[PDB]
Design a protein around this ligand. Structure first.
Ligand code: CLA
Ligand code: CLA
Ligand code: CLA
Ligand code: CLA
Ligand code: CLA
Ligand code: CLA
Ligand code: CLA
Ligand code: LHG
Ligand code: PQN
Lengths: 74, 161
């Protein structure tokens, strides 16, 4: 079975220190291996100060959002 | 090159100060009259340009009367550019003394204020890079110093000559 957010679904970042904290990003892929601590790879429209907009997150650091339960205006 | 530009500014500023004081001293000396032929020293430069206090009193403070008393006269523009040059030069000090990180954190707080009101610019606000900050500071420093000297020299040499 698939564990974690669905591919391509918007998620809100719950990692306090992340540049996109409480912001929204699109899930690229979730590594379906139990040993991976940060499988959820999320892509963001905004780039951080390192000019990188893709990062991996833990399962508990991302909140999957429904198709219309978030704010489209960020 | 960034530091050498400051030192070039210092060098050329001292050079033009030397030239301007020598020029004014020669103009005053040739304004002996005709009979006065013992200039002794006089030569305000030759008699006073031997101290830092001598410069600060008899050149900068002495000739600044023309540029600071220019209000209401055609040299009021020189006075205003004098003030603006001082302003730009202190703004340079702002850019040169400070650093990128602080301004980045300040912009983070300001950008939170923006996001709170659904403003959210997408060209993400980043403060000037370290080299960009140094370059802006140097540009403002050169502009302010050179403009101050420009206004001072022009007001002094137009009002008195
Ligand atoms: C908010 C911050 C702030 C402000 C506003 C000032 C204000 C000033 N500082 Mg300053 N300063 C500050 C913080 C500040 N200080 C701090 C924290 C430090 C570090 C300790 C300093 C260190 C410092 C130094 C070392 C010096 C100053 C100086 C000055 C003066 C510049 C001369 C002047 O009035 O030019 C403005 C006056 C004018 C007449 C300009 C108006 C006319 C011009 C030509 C047009 C400009 C308008 C502009 C372009 C807008 C038009 C838009 C249009 C084009 C569309 C002025 C009183 C200088 C000074 O007073 O020397 C004695 C100076 O040398 N400051
Ligand atoms: C008295 C106020 C004052 C003045 C005179 C300047 C002047 C300048 N700033 Mg500046 N600045 C100011 C306040 C001021 N600043 C303040 C308060 C801040 C915020 C803290 C900044 C932040 C800032 C940054 C971040 C940067 C500057 C830069 C510059 C330079 C731009 C170079 C240029 O013209 O590119 C164009 C070059 C040309 C050759 C164009 C031709 C010259 C034009 C035609 C002159 C006339 C300008 C224009 C027509 C006047 C009318 C404008 C409009 C009303 C029509 C110039 C020396 C930039 C540069 O710094 O240095 C690296 C830069 O990156 N400034
Ligand atoms: C390395 C780069 C470089 C070089 C070679 C020069 C060269 C020169 N600059 Mg110059 N300049 C430079 C960078 C440089 N500049 C920079 C970066 C700035 C910006 C701050 C300036 C700003 C500047 C100004 C504002 C002026 C000059 C002037 C001059 C001229 C000085 C003539 C003079 O006083 O004769 C004196 C030198 C001699 C007569 C040569 C002999 C001196 C002694 C006796 C030699 C001893 C030899 C000894 C036997 C052997 C020694 C060996 C030992 C070293 C091991 C000369 C052509 C001046 C000029 O052109 O006025 C007309 C001038 O007004 N420069
Ligand atoms: C670091 C410097 C910097 C630079 C170069 C820009 C550049 C820009 N910002 Mg911006 N911004 C910054 C910092 C910066 N911002 C910061 C720190 C914040 C707060 C967090 C914002 C918040 C912000 C918002 C909220 C908006 C912009 C907008 C804009 C664009 C319009 C420019 C403008 O206002 O013209 C002003 C007019 C002139 C420059 C003409 C005068 C010419 C003189 C001589 C200069 C432009 C791409 C706007 C945008 O996207 O446009 C559609 C917009 O809505 N920015
Ligand atoms: C044009 C000026 C201006 C602007 C754009 C803002 C913008 C903001 N203020 Mg604010 N504020 C200002 C002046 C301003 N302030 C001044 C002068 C005061 C002193 C009385 C305050 C006192 C103040 C408090 C006490 C709070 C804000 C808050 C806020 C944020 C939520 C907006 C809000 O409560 O809507 C209100 C709309 C109409 C009343 C937003 C970033 C709130 C915030 O950030 O909470 C997280 C908040 O609690 N402001
Ligand atoms: C708050 C006080 C204050 C501050 C911070 C400033 C700031 C400034 N003034 Mg200023 N000024 C002030 C008050 C102030 N003014 C007052 C009250 C007056 C009287 C009305 C003046 C009259 C005045 C004049 C007439 C001039 C300035 C200039 C300057 C600029 C010098 C920039 C620089 O780095 O020079 C670098 C420093 C130097 C080049 C040193 C020159 C000063 C000494 C006395 C010359 C000594 C020469 C001697 C041979 C020793 C040389 C040593 C060598 C290694 C440097 C700067 C914008 C000058 C300018 O445009 O730039 C130079 C200028 O022409 N101001
Ligand atoms: C104290 C230093 C100093 C002095 C006395 C002069 C003296 C002179 N320069 Mg000059 N210059 C200098 C430094 C200096 N330069 C430096 C460091 C640069 C490099 C940027 C230049 C670049 C330069 C150019 C590109 C030009 C001059 C020109 C001139 C001549 C007329 C002045 C002028 O047009 O100003 C210009 C003054 C202003 C535009 C005032 C603007 C004030 C603000 C923007 C108005 C605000 C309105 C609100 C005169 C021989 C001009 C020339 O050859 O004669 C036609 C000319 O085209 N200079
Ligand atoms: C008499 C007056 C004299 C003034 C000073 C003249 C000499 C200055 C010499 C030092 C600077 C040289 C810079 C060359 C170029 C250089 O070396 O750049 C210096 C610096 C480089 O930063 P970075 O290295 O981060 O740039 C990225 C690159 O490294 C890799 O892509 O860039 C800037 O300062 C950005 C702004 C430059 C362009 C400014 C345009 C301003 C437009 C209007 C701004 C708003 C309105 C203002 C009013
Ligand atoms: C203030 C400051 C910033 C912040 C500067 C920023 C964010 C640049 C943006 C400033 C805007 C573009 C000013 C626009 C021009 C002004 C409105 C004044 C010109 C027009 C008036 C004369 C009317 C840095 O990024 C920085 C970096 C490294 C060292 C020192 C510093 C530094 O001192």
């Amino acid at each position: 079975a698939w564990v974690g957010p669905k591919k391509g679904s918007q998620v809100r970042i719950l990692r306090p220190e992340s540049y996109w904290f409480q912001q929204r990003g699109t899930v690229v892929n979730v590594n379906q291996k139990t040993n991976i601590k940060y499988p959820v790879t999320v892509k963001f429209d905004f780039v951080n100060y390192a000019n990188v907009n893709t990062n991996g997150f833990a399962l508990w650091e991302v909140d999957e959002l429904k198709e219309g339960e978030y704010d489209p205006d960020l | 090159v960034f530091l050498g530009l400051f030192w070039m500014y210092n060098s050329i500023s001292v050079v033009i100060f030397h030239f301007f004081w020598e020029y004014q001293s020669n103009l005053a000396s040739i304004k002996a009259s005709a009979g006065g032929s013992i200039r002794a020293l006089a030569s305000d430069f030759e008699l006073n340009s031997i101290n830092t206090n001598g410069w600060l009193r008899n050149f900068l403070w002495s000739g600044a009367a023309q540029v600071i008393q220019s209000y209401g006269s055609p040299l009021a523009a020189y006075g205003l550019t004098f003030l603006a040059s001082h302003f730009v030069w202190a703004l340079s000090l702002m850019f040169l003394f400070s650093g990128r990180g602080y301004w980045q954190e300040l912009i983070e707080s300001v950008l939170w204020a923006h996001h709170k009101l659904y403003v959210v610019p997408h060209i993400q606000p980043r403060a000037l890079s370290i080299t960009s900050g140094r370059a802006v500071g140097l540009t403002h420093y050169l502009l302010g110093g050179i403009g101050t000297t420009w206004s001072f020299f022009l007001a002094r040499i137009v009002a008195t000559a």
